[PDB]
């Protein structure tokens, strides 16, 4: 109830819960754009969870993998769910 999650570049604010992984490669919509090269634990996706203000939920590039974003996809599942699938190559 009145509690959702968002896809935007998180920025501390009372919680601070974030990790080493850079967020600089993140666009304001929390998704890297295809052409961009990634590595280490760079943040592929940025996500938020205002638990009963801003605890960082977000997927970092798996520690020992390093390629280039190939394509990003933004859809929805039955329950108007904002769906995301990032493909690194």
């Amino acid at each position: 109830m009145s509690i959702t999650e968002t896809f935007e570049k998180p920025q501390r604010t009372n919680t601070l819960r974030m990790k080493h992984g850079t967020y600089d490669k993140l666009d304001d919509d929390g998704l890297i754009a295809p052409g961009v090269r990634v590595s280490g634990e760079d943040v592929i996706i940025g996500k938020t969870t205002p638990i009963s203000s801003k605890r960082d939920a977000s997927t970092p590039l798996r520690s020992t993998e390093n390629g280039i974003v190939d394509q990003v996809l933004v859809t929805t599942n039955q329950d108007g769910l904002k769906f995301v699938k990032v493909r690194v190559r």
Partner: protein, 46 residues
């Protein structure tokens, strides 16, 4: 002319803000790809 998204069927350089769920113009395909990147990538020819 700047965009942020693209449909996988009509390839219309869409892009919209919040409260627009997911859709294209006439192409109600709820998919959308994230265009490309402007900073261009450099490649090792090796």
């Amino acid at each position: 002319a700047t965009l942020k998204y693209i449909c996988a069927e009509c390839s219309s350089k869409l892009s919209l803000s919040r409260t627009d769920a997911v859709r294209c113009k006439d192409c109600g395909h709820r998919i959308l790809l994230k265009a490309r990147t402007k900073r261009l990538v450099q490649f090792e020819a090796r």
